[PDB]
Curated annotation (Swiss-Prot), chains A, B, C, D:
A lipid is attached at S28 (S-palmitoyl cysteine). Cytoplasmic tail plays an important role in virion assembly and morphogenesis. The record marks H15 as: Essential for channel activity, possibly by being protonated during channel activation, and by forming the channel gate and the selective filter. Strain A/Udorn/307/72 is a laboratory-adapted strain. The lineage of its organism: Viruses, Riboviria, Orthornavirae, Negarnaviricota, Polyploviricotina. Belongs to the influenza viruses matrix protein M2 family. It comes from the Viruses. This is Matrix protein 2. Homotetramer; composed of two disulfide-linked dimers held together by non-covalent interactions. May interact with matrix protein 1.
Amino acid sequence: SDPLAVAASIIGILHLILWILDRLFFKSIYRFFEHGLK
Amino acid sequence: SDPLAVAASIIGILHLILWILDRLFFKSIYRFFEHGLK
Amino acid sequence: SDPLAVAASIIGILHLILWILDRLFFKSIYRFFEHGLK
Amino acid sequence: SDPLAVAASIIGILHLILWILDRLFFKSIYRFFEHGLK
C-alpha cells in the first residue's frame, strides 16, 4: 500500500544497474569518450 | 503526507534525467571536461 | 518492519559506497579504462 | 515509520551533490584521471 516506496526500490535498482551496465557493453566507454572528444 | 518519501522519488527522477541529459546534448561531455580543466 | 524501506536504505548506502570504491580500489580507474579499451 | 528513510534522503541528496561538485570544483577530473594513470 505504498507505490511511492515501491517506486524508490525499483528506481534504485534500475538506477544503479542501469549505470554500471550502460558503462559495460562492448565499446560504449570508448564510443562516448571519443565522440565527446571531437 | 510524506515529504520524505516524495523527496526520495523526486530526487531519483531528477537524478536520472540530469545524469543522462547532462551527459549527452550539445557535446556536453566536452563542456564539462573543459570546464574542470579551466 | 519494512523490508521495502530497509531495502531502499541498503540500496542507497551500497550505491554511494560502490561508486566511490569502484572508482578507486587499486586504481580500478586504469583497470576499467584498459579493459574497455579492448 | 522509517527513520532509515531519512538516512536515504540525506545520502541521496548528498550523493548527487558529491557527484556534481566532485566533477567540477578545482580540476578534480584531472586529479582522479592523473591519479589512476600514475
